[PDB]
Design a protein around this motif. Sequence first.
Motif, PDB file in Angstrom:
ATOM      1  N   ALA A  34      58.632  40.071  -6.179  1.00 40.39           N
ATOM      2  CA  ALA A  34      57.733  41.141  -5.763  1.00 40.39           C
ATOM      3  C   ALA A  34      56.367  40.911  -6.399  1.00 40.39           C
ATOM      4  O   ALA A  34      56.027  41.469  -7.434  1.00 40.39           O
ATOM      5  N   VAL A  36      53.581  41.232  -4.187  1.00 34.12           N
ATOM      6  CA  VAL A  36      52.924  41.573  -2.931  1.00 34.12           C
ATOM      7  C   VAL A  36      51.854  42.616  -3.230  1.00 34.12           C
ATOM      8  O   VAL A  36      52.188  43.690  -3.751  1.00 34.12           O
ATOM      9  N   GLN A  38      50.003  44.357  -1.002  1.00 35.89           N
ATOM     10  CA  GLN A  38      49.753  45.338   0.043  1.00 35.89           C
ATOM     11  C   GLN A  38      50.985  46.060   0.560  1.00 35.89           C
ATOM     12  O   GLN A  38      50.834  47.055   1.274  1.00 35.89           O
ATOM     13  N   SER A  39      52.187  45.607   0.235  1.00 38.10           N
ATOM     14  CA  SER A  39      53.400  46.281   0.668  1.00 38.10           C
ATOM     15  C   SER A  39      54.215  46.690  -0.546  1.00 38.10           C
ATOM     16  O   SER A  39      54.132  46.068  -1.607  1.00 38.10           O
ATOM     17  N   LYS A  40      55.004  47.744  -0.386  1.00 37.12           N
ATOM     18  CA  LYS A  40      55.778  48.291  -1.484  1.00 37.12           C
ATOM     19  C   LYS A  40      57.258  48.317  -1.141  1.00 37.12           C
ATOM     20  O   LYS A  40      57.644  48.401   0.027  1.00 37.12           O
ATOM     21  N   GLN A  41      58.085  48.237  -2.179  1.00 38.10           N
ATOM     22  CA  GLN A  41      59.524  48.337  -2.039  1.00 38.10           C
ATOM     23  C   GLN A  41      59.943  49.800  -1.984  1.00 38.10           C
ATOM     24  O   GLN A  41      59.168  50.709  -2.281  1.00 38.10           O
ATOM     25  N   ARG A  42      61.192  50.026  -1.601  1.00 43.81           N
ATOM     26  CA  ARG A  42      61.692  51.381  -1.453  1.00 43.81           C
ATOM     27  C   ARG A  42      63.146  51.436  -1.889  1.00 43.81           C
ATOM     28  O   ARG A  42      63.936  50.552  -1.559  1.00 43.81           O
TER      29      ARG A  42
ATOM     30  N   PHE B   8      57.478  36.202   0.275  1.00 48.38           N
ATOM     31  CA  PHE B   8      56.739  37.181   1.065  1.00 48.38           C
ATOM     32  C   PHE B   8      55.297  36.724   1.208  1.00 48.38           C
ATOM     33  O   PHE B   8      54.404  37.256   0.539  1.00 48.38           O
ATOM     34  N   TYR B  10      51.660  36.165   3.419  1.00 50.21           N
ATOM     35  CA  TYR B  10      50.895  36.948   4.373  1.00 50.21           C
ATOM     36  C   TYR B  10      49.889  36.038   5.056  1.00 50.21           C
ATOM     37  O   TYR B  10      49.623  34.922   4.609  1.00 50.21           O
TER      38      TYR B  10
END
Lengths: 49, 84
Positions: A34, A36, A38-42, B8, B10
């Motif tokens: 992780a 990233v 711009q994106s998040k985990q849930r 991941f 982009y």
Amino acid sequence: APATIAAGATGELTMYYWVPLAYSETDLTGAVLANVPQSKQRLKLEFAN
Amino acid sequence: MALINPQFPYAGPVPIPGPAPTETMPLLNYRVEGRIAGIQQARQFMPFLQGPHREVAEQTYYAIGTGIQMGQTFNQPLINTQEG
């Protein structure tokens, strides 16, 4: 957890869960890198009612 | 100098709504001709003097004369007749 809550009493429960992503501490199979921006985990958690 | 995430990744930037492209372009502002107005005076009645000053004062002199020098009536000594 108390084994019996009597009429009027109050019990205190404690419980631990391990939600795994990697398989073990020596096997990184299933792990998530992780980094990233711009994106998040849930982690959806639904409890007893 | 970021590290690429291989799990991941982009892509590059996608198009987004824009800020009405002529409204980010300015006009070039159009100067008219100007003038330092009025007829200037040649000199100014200044509140301070424009020359040097002296830190200390020096005493000045002027020569004077004395007068007509006269003679005198001296008291005259005695004659050296082997007493003196």
